[PDB]
Amino acid sequence: MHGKLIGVGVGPGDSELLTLRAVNVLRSVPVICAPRSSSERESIALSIVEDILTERRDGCRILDPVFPMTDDRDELESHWDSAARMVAAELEDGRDVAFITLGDPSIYSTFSYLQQRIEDMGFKTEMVPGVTSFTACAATAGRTLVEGDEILLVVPRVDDRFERVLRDVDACVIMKTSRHGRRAMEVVESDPRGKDVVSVANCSMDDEVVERGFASGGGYLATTLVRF
Amino acid sequence: MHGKLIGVGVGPGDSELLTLRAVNVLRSVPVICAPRSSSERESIALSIVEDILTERRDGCRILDPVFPMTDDRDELESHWDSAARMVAAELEDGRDVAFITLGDPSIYSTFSYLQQRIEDMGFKTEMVPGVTSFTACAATAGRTLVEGDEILLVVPRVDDRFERVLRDVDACVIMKTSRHGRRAMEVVESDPRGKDVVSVANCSMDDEVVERGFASGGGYLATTLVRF
Ligand SMILES: Nc1ncnc2c1ncn2[C@@H]1O[C@H](CSCC[C@H](N)C(=O)O)[C@@H](O)[C@H]1O
Numbered sequence: 506m507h508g509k510l511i512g513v514g515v516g517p518g519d520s521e522l523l524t525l526r527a528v529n530v531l532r533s534v535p536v537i538c539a540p541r542s543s544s545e546r547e548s549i550a551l552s553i554v555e556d557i558l559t560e561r562r563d564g565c566r567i568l569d570p571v572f573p574m575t576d577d578r579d580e581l582e583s584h585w586d587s588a589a590r591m592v593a594a595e596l597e598d599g600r601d602v603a604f605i606t607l608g609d610p611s612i613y614s615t616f617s618y619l620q621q622r623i624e625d626m627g628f629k630t631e632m633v634p635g636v637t638s639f640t641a642c643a644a645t646a647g648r649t650l651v652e653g654d655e656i657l658l659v660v661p662r663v664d665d666r667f668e669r670v671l672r673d674v675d676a677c678v679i680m681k682t683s684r685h686g687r688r689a690m691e692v693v694e695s696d697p698r699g700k701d702v703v704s705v706a707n708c709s710m711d712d713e714v715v716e717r718g719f720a721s722g723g724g725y726l727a728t729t730l731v732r733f
Numbered sequence: 734m735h736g737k738l739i740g741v742g743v744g745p746g747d748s749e750l751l752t753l754r755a756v757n758v759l760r761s762v763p764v765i766c767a768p769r770s771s772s773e774r775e776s777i778a779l780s781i782v783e784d785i786l787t788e789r790r791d792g793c794r795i796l797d798p799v800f801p802m803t804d805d806r807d808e809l810e811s812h813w814d815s816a817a818r819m820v821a822a823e824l825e826d827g828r829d830v831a832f833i834t835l836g837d838p839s840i841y842s843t844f845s846y847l848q849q850r851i852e853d854m855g856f857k858t859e860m861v862p863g864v865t866s867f868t869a870c871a872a873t874a875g876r877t878l879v880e881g882d883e884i885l886l887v888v889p890r891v892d893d894r895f896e897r898v899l900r901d902v903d904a905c906v907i908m909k910t911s912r913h914g915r916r917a918m919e920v921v922e923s924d925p926r927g928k929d930v931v932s933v934a935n936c937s938m939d940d941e942v943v944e945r946g947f948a949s950g951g952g953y954l955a956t957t958l959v960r961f
């Protein structure tokens with residue numbers, strides 16, 4: 506009888522990159538959870554599912570717990586606490602909640618922060634996978650990531666681990682690349698092997714930018730793909 | 734006027750894990766390329782997609798070239814040369830061909846072997862991203878893969894590189910897992926960190942099996958997920 510928490514991957518931007526399953530959950534759940542920063546009117550995940558939500562003859566309740574960009578670790582933790590409290594109030598009343606996530610819910614989505622709390626409160630949890638941004642970026646660039654015996658590495662940051670590991674991998678995905686392109690260029694280009702590098706911003710959206718090398722547009726939604 | 738080649742990710746098994754975009758392509762292309770071994774009536778990719786194809790009003794031609802069951806010998810390359818000729822003959826006649834691929838076409842897919850040849854012969858090529866099997870596995874397991882500054886490693890087999898790189902990553906995907914889990918287990922167990930492990934066979938299919946730790950013999954479509 507409890508509501509369940511469902512982590513729903515929404516894909517990289519284009520509504521046509523939602524899965525049939527995602528579309529089905531989102532057309533049916535009574536509650537959607539789409540967290541946002543303080544100066545956002547709506548998260549990017551909510552704007553992706555806008556048309557679906559407004560197509561609905563039935564009403565959907567939107568939970569949009571606020572996450573200030575300025576939170577220190579303790580305030581962030583406390584803001585996840587109250588997010589879980591508003592979500593659990595829905596599940597306590599028998600209503601399923603779909604937590605929408607850009608791309609796929611298993612890849613840097615923040616889903617686990619809510620998920621751990623909700624399962625600790627004794628509720629049940631599910632996940633719907635999606636097109637992750639990095640395979641969508643490979644697709645738009647007309648490029649394959651890995652084949653045969655090649656190793657893929659996915660990083661959110663340029664760090665010392667990244668540097669010492671790089672020679673033992675054949676391809677790598679660099680997330681948040683508007684913050685990370687410069688450091689990334691330096692590390693990858695010091696590698697003696699031939700490399701093919703491309704960066705993609707706003708993949709699958711109207712303002713998508715494909716650029717050779719370690720930069721594209723400077724917005725939050727940029728990813729770099731490296732193949733050796 | 735010449736047709737174009739489109740690499741279409743079909744997801745891990747469940748037809749509901751298709752994107753709307755893949756559906757759209759699959760409903761309208763005149764030709765589908767779905768290579769197979771002789772021991773199969775249809776590839777796994779074609780069986781995922783069969784109900785879309787049967788339900789079309791407008792008929793579809795299937796190219797299903799047989800490849801020798803071998804991972805090993807560049808006996809495969811002469812077979813790709815002949816399949817590319819087969820595909821090019823459709824493109825030359827102004828017919829689009831969708832090459833369907835399990836999961837996503839950028840991730841250990843066979844698409845790149847056909848793509849390079851078709852592009853070398855002077856035809857246009859496109860990709861439609863899909864739900865990749867490793868994130869679909871994480872979703873069925875109810876586990877997220879990476880958050881925050883965690884680093885993800887995806888490996889097709891477990892060799893010396895895996896061992897040397899492990900302590901520098903926070904999560905790893907082991908593909909073809911029914912064969913590699915033995916050496917994988919030992920490496921993972923000897924890591925000093927707390928860890929959880931889950932193995933998923935036939936993710937999203939009727940006969941999906943999920944079990945904690947290194948499950949030992951899940952057949953071809955089996956993946957192991959490790960988080961530290
Ligand atoms: N549409 C898009 N185009 C390019 N990169 C994108 C993108 N959407 C998300 N990203 C990438 O994802 C990062 C946010 S972390 C969220 C990742 C998401 N769960 C996924 O599966 O893709 C961004 O910094 C960027 O690296």
Ligand SMILES: Nc1ncnc2c1ncn2[C@@H]1O[C@H](CSCC[C@H](N)C(=O)O)[C@@H](O)[C@H]1O
Pocket residue numbers: 745746834835836837838839840841842864865866867870907908909910933934935936937938953954955956
């Ligand atoms: N339905 C499924 N369940 C579990 N693993 C799967 C799977 N489908 C594919 N795989 C994984 O993929 C490997 C074949 S490599 C093909 C990968 C595919 N392009 C994708 O994106 O997922 C298998 O050895 C297995 O590790």
